[PDB]
């Protein structure tokens, strides 16, 4: 019986880009959500299936805590039945979404003068994504007909693009960090609640 | 698969490249324009070269796509905006000579310096020398000499330069499949292949022709009144039946007539409306000016400015430790960053210009979500249009009576309102005839219908017939008077101001009639009328994604330029002049000259 280590999850300092969205399985621990709820200092805290409080004393078999960073205006992109770049090619949500989506401003950390370029996101793809899949396979997207043998050039573009993060951005373009907690309800023994 | 999806993919990637490059360049240019330092200019020119070369190579890559093999309009709009190679496509030798022409003429205009015939080492540059020389002075001879000298030093130099400039430019436009370059300047207004909103290049010339046709009587009464007044000011140099001195237009040319207002006050005993001492006594500062402008813009339902705008932008003269080119400008660095740059003092003029720039920035805040190349006005005038309408609104006596800058027991009536009208006239009615004269003059030049050996000669005739100003000096082919002005010498399309002037007043009528206003337009305000604000936003949110005239109709309900907004706006002043001019003439002869003694 241990507390679910949400702490060094929500406020670690190295978050990956969406195209390689990070995921950690949480189980075999007791989970104290209501503290993270009543933190109440986030810029957005939604989810789809339970009141913020009632989820506390109703529990699951396992949960997945995924993290990434996106641009502000695209927080709306992350929700069941949502479309758009980060929704269709980078992070796709199922429609019976069990988890919760928390998102906070991070402009004072993840951006810096000159513009950070560590953070990435995929720009094109032959077709949209399945639910919940990670894709680091990065072969050139074929935009035209001429097979150009893996090079940058005309109708051959690299599927990844670097976010521009200069801290003088509008809130809609300043970076926003996002965590999502996908719960499952299965037949496994007593591994998740608190 | 198809061509069109490929083009959209291309534009997608191009958006997130050009956005970032433009942000870098804009931020660098800003950091320069706020604090004059050398390596700032260095990194600025670096980023600017980056952005420019990137744009050129993108245009070359883009021309690899067929135009008519695309059907979705927006894509065609973006691709015509991008693929137009322009001067870049001509021969590298000729393009280099062209770049030299630009820098040469511009630097001669911006560094030209006139020196009195008595002192070879005491003399004045244009800015701000000749400006005040022509504005604050009442001196006949001073203005005469300054006029001729400034037309002598730079213009006579730049004459063949501008000639060959026109030549290479028309060859360039031919290479762009344009009939000539003035046509290319028109081409921004051109609209193709959309039902109910077609627009030809010559459709524009017809538009401007007709607009000025109905404008004619207003400006004719204006000329009459000013002629009478300056005659009272200069009995030995104005006959009340002819044109006006080309050296007494308050400035070097007659682009604005505000300076003559001081001379032609309609009633020099009624106090003029200003709250400068008032804003002082009430302990205001630039910060509070802009906060009140934000309050106003909220009062029309638009979103208040971004937090980043407040914490980031430079709003006041940054002390005396650093100097900068802080002429009032409003920057949209893209990607959600919007700033205003102005060494804001505290006065009524700053109060107006602050709202002007706030209109600029709000306008840009509207169309953030559109693709890159659409992040600009429906035309090349709507920016200054929205920037001028908010100012015009706030400058009414009543809106000031609202937020407590005027005496709540103020008595506003006939004489003072005609004063305010005639002032705003000299500001805004002034630009119509002069602007149109110059624009169509340059259009004929690009149309080459005028032999070089007669340019100046026909020049003043247009000044003569269309605008009514007489030259003070005999002019042979030694003159290049057009280049004697910034936008000409600096090669800027000059119609945009005429178009802006018309569009703002169409906007004024549209919004006041949509704000359920009753009565005189010249007293109108939009604030607190969320309905009219929503009306305006309904167009602001388009930028230039829709054809511009569709955007205009989304405001006024007329699909074309209309001047009757203007004459209606002024009709108080119109009748007033129609009375004032009973005993004096309107109209002039094309032969007269002050030196035709
Ligand atoms: C991370 O930052 C939040 C503020 O949003 C703070 O409440 C939290 O305590 C920090 N993390 C840790 C482990 O303290
Ligand atoms: C202007 O820029 C220089 C170089 O970045 C800087 O050292 C200086 O402090 C700036 N001016 C002011 C008033 O800070
Ligand atoms: C053009 O494409 C955009 C997005 O690709 C789409 O929203 C729009 O509807 C298209 N144009 C028309 C006329 O449907
Ligand atoms: C801007 O106006 C909105 C309109 O309701 C308001 O909610 C918001 O608080 C204002 N901005 C700030 C920083 O308070
Ligand atoms: C706008 O509405 C507010 C709220 O009543 C009022 O205090 C203010 O005087 C109004 N101003 C104008 C110009 O209507």
DSSP string, chain A: --B---HHHHT-S-PPPGGG-EEEEE-SBB--HHHHHHT--SSEEEESSS-TTTTTTS--SEEEEEEEEEEGGGGGGSSTT--SHIIIII----SS--SEEEEEE-HHHH--TT-B-S-EEE---SS-PPTT------PPEE-SSS--SS-SBTTEE-SEEEPPB-TTS-TTTSEEEEEEEEEE--S--S-B--
Instruction: Identify the residue whose tokens are 């097979």.
Output: A147
Ligand 1 proximity of A13 Cβ (cutoff 6 Å) = no
On whether both B570 and B457 belong to a single domain, the answer is yes
Q: Which residue, B442, B452, B444, B481, is CA-closest to B254? A: B481
What are the residue numbers of the active site of B? 357, 487
Among protein residues, the one whose CA lies closest to atom 1 of ligand 2: B35
By the 8 A CB rule, do A155 and A143 touch? Answer: yes
Least CB-CB distance to A168: which of B6, B20, B312? B312
Q: Which residue has the tokens 């230039």?
A: B544
Q: Residues B260, B315: one domain?
A: no
Domain identity same for B413 and B557: yes
* Residue B33 and residue B125 in one domain: no
Total domains, chain A: 1
CATH number, domain at A100? Answer: 3.30.70.1840
> Which of B448-455's residues contact partners 24+ apart within 8 Å by CB, and which partners?
B448/B170, B448/B180, B452/B163, B452/B477, B453/B477
Whether residue B534 sits in one domain with residue B417 = yes
Peptide bond into A115 cis (omega under 30): no
CB A120 within 8 A of CB A89: no
Question: Does residue A190 form part of some domain?
Answer: no
Cβ-proximal residues to B353 (8 Å cutoff; 6+ apart), any chain: B328, B342, B391
CATH of the domain at B147: 1.10.1370.10
Question: Do the beta carbons of residue A188 and residue A85 sit within 8 Å?
Answer: no
Distance CA B382, CA B422 (A): 24
For residue B403, count other CB atoms closer than 10 A to its CB. Answer: 12
In a domain, B370, yes or no: yes
Q: Is A108 on the interface with B (CB under 8 A)?
A: no
Minimum CA–CA partner of B25 in chain A: A114
Residues B267 and B339 both lie in one domain:
no
Query: For residues A58, A59, A65 and A66, what is the CA-based torsion angle, rounded to 10 degrees?
Result: -70
Q: Are B8 and B113 found together in one domain?
A: no
In a domain, A85, yes or no: yes
Q: Are B556 and B510 in contact (CB under 8 A)?
A: yes
Burial of B402 (0-12, 13-18, 19+ CB in 10 A): middle
* Residue A87, domain member (yes or no): yes
Please measure the distance between the N-terminal and C-terminal CA atoms of chain B and give it in whole angstroms: 78
In sequence order, the 6+-apart residues with CB closer than 8 A to the CB of B450 are B444, B458
Q: Which of A124, A154, A170 sits opposite B337 (nearest CB)?
A: A170
User: In angstroms, what is the C-alpha Rg of chain A?
Assistant: 18
Cβ neighbours of A159 (radius 10 Å): 19
- Tell me if chain A has a CB within 8 Å of the CB of B20: yes
Per the domain annotation, does A1 fall within a domain?
no
Decide if A155 and B10 are in contact by the 8 Å CB cutoff: yes
The DSSP secondary structure of B361-428, one letter per residue, reads: HHHHHHGGGS-GGG-S-SSSSHHHHHHHHHHHHHTSHHHHHHTT-S-TT----HHHHHHHHHHHHHHH
Residue B472 in contact with residue B595, Cβ under 8 Å? yes
Contact partners, residue B120, CB within 8 Å, separation at least 6:
none
Query: Is the sign of the CA dihedral A186, A187, A188, A194 positive or negative?
Result: positive
In angstroms, this model's resolution equals 3.7
Distance CA B467, CA B470 (A): 9
Asked if residue B400 belongs to a domain, the reply is no
Residues B54 and B98 in one domain: no
The reply to whether B31 and B135 lie within a common domain is no
Experimental method: cryo-EM
Q: Could you give the C-alpha distances from A33 to A12, A51, A104, B17, in angstroms and in order?
A: 17, 12, 16, 41
Q: Tally the domains of chain B.
A: 3
Structural domain that includes position B303: 282-385
How far, in Å, CA of A158 to CA of A124, rounded?
Answer: 8
Question: Is A2 inside a domain boundary?
Answer: no
Query: Which positions ≥6 away from B168 have C-beta within 8 Å?
Result: B90, B94, B97, B98, B101
* DSSP3 helix / strand / coil % (chain B, rounded to 5): 60, 5, 35
Query: What is the phi/psi pair of residue A65, to 5°?
Result: -105, 110
Any CB–CB contact under 8 A between B239 and chain A?
Answer: no
- How far apart CA B322 and CA B329 sit, in angstroms, is 18
The angle subtended at Cα B345 by Cα B501 and Cα B261, nearest 5°, is 45
Of B32, B60, B84, the last residue of a domain is B84
Shared domain for B539 and B582, answered yes or no, is yes
CB B304 less than 6 A from any atom of ligand 4: yes
Give one DSSP letter per residue of B136-202, joined into a string.
T---HHHHHHHHHHHIIIIIHHHHHHHHHHHHHHHHHHHHTT-SSHHHHHHTTT-B-S-TT--B-HH
A191 within domain boundaries: no
Name the pairing type of β-strands B244-245 and B469-470. Answer: parallel
Going from the C-alpha of B169 to that of each of A34, B172, B184, the distances in angstroms are 70, 5, 10
Q: Which two tokens stand for residue B84?
A: 């137009």
B67/B203 same-domain check: no
Has residue B392 been placed in a domain? no
Residue B556 lies in a domain: yes
Q: To probe the interface with B, which of A170, A171, A175 has the most B CB atoms within 10 Å? A: A170
Q: Which two tokens stand for residue B544?
A: 């230039």
Which domain covers residue A28, as residue numbers? Answer: 7-184
């Amino acid at each position: 019986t241990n507390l679910c280590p949400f702490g060094e999850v929500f406020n670690a300092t190295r978050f990956a880009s969406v195209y390689a969205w990070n995921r950690k399985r949480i189980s075999n621990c007791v989970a104290d959500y209501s503290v993270l709820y009543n933190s109440a200092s986030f810029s957005t805290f939604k989810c789809y299936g339970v009141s913020p409080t009632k989820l506390n004393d109703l529990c699951f078999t396992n949960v997945y805590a995924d993290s990434f960073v996106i641009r502000g205006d695209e927080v709306r992109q992350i929700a069941p039945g949502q479309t758009g770049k980060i929704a269709d090619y980078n992070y796709k949500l199922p429609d019976d979404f069990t988890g919760c989506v928390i998102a906070w401003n991070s402009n004072n950390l993840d951006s810096k003068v000159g513009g950070n370029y560590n953070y990435l996101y995929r720009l094109f793809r032959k077709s949209n994504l399945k639910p919940f899949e990670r894709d680091i396979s990065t072969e050139i997207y074929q935009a035209g007909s001429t097979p150009c043998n893996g090079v940058e050039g005309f109708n051959c573009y690299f599927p990844l693009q670097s976010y521009g993060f200069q801290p003088t951005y509008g809130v809609g373009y300043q970076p926003y960090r996002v965590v999502v907690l996908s719960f499952e309800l299965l037949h496994a023994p007593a591994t998740v609640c608190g | 698969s198809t061509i069109e999806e490929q083009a959209k993919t291309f534009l997608d990637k191009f958006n997130h490249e050009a956005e970032d490059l433009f942000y870098q360049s804009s931020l660098a240019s800003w950091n320069y324009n706020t604090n004059i330092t050398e390596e700032n200019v260095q990194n600025m020119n670096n980023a600017g070269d980056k952005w420019s070369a990137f744009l050129k190579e993108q245009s070359t890559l883009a021309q690899m796509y067929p135009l008519q093999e695309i059907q979705n309009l927006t894509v065609k709009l973006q691709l015509q905006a991008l693929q137009q190679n322009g001067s870049s496509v001509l021969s590298e030798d000729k393009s280099k000579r062209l770049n030299t022409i630009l820098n040469t003429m511009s630097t001669i205009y911006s560094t030209g310096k006139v020196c009195n015939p008595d002192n070879p080492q005491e003399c004045l540059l244009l800015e701000p020398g000749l400006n005040e020389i022509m504005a604050n002075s009442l001196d006949y001879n001073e203005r005469l000499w300054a006029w001729e000298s400034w037309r002598s030093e730079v213009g006579k130099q730049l004459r063949p330069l501008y000639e060959e400039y026109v030549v290479l430019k028309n060859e360039m436009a031919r290479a762009n499949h344009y009939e000539d370059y003035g046509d290319y300047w028109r081409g921004d207004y051109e609209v193709n292949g959309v039902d109910g909103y077609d627009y030809s290049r010559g459709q524009l010339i017809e538009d401007v022709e007709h607009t000025f046709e109905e404008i004619k009587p207003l400006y004719e009464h204006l000329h009459a009144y000013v002629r009478a007044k300056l005659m009272n000011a200069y009995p030995s140099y104005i006959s009340p039946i002819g044109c006006l001195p080309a050296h007494l237009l308050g400035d070097m040319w007659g682009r604005f007539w505000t300076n003559l207002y001081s001379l032609t006050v309609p009633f020099g005993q009624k106090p003029n409306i200003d709250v400068t001492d008032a804003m002082v006594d009430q302990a205001w500062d630039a910060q509070r000016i802009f906060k009140e402008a934000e309050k106003f813009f909220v009062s029309v339902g638009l979103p208040n400015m971004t937090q980043g705008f407040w914490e980031n932008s430079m709003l006041t003269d940054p002390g005396n430790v650093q100097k900068a080119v802080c002429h009032p400008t409003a920057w949209d660095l893209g990607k959600g960053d919007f700033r205003i740059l102005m060494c804001t003092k505290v006065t009524m003029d700053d109060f107006l210009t602050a709202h002007h720039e706030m209109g600029h920035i709000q306008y840009d805040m509207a169309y953030a979500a559109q693709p890159f190349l659409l992040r600009n006005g429906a035309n090349e005038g709507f920016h200054e249009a929205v920037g001028e309408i908010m100012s015009l609104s706030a400058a009414t006596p009543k809106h000031l009576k609202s937020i407590g800058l005027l005496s709540p027991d103020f008595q506003e009536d006939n004489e003072t309102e005609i004063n305010f009208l005639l002032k705003q006239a000299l500001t805004i009615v002034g630009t119509l005839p002069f602007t149109y004269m110059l624009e169509k003059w340059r259009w004929m030049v690009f149309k080459g219908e005028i032999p070089k050996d007669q340019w100046m000669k026909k020049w003043w005739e247009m000044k003569r017939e269309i605008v009514g100003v007489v030259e003070p000096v005999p002019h042979d082919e030694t003159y290049c008077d057009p280049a004697s002005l910034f936008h000409v010498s600096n090669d800027y399309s000059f119609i945009r101001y005429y178009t802006r002037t018309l569009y703002q007043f169409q906007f004024q009528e549209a919004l006041c009639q949509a704000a359920k206003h009753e009565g005189p337009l010249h007293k109108c305000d939009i604030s607190n009328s969320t309905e009219a604000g929503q009306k305006l936003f309904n167009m602001l949110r388009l930028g230039k994604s829709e054809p511009w005239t569709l955007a205009l109709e989304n405001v006024v309900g007329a699909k074309n330029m209309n001047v009757r907004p203007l004459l209606n706006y002024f009709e108080p002043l119109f009748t007033w002049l129609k009375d004032q001019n009973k005993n004096s003439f309107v109209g002039w002869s094309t032969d007269w000259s002050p030196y035709a003694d």
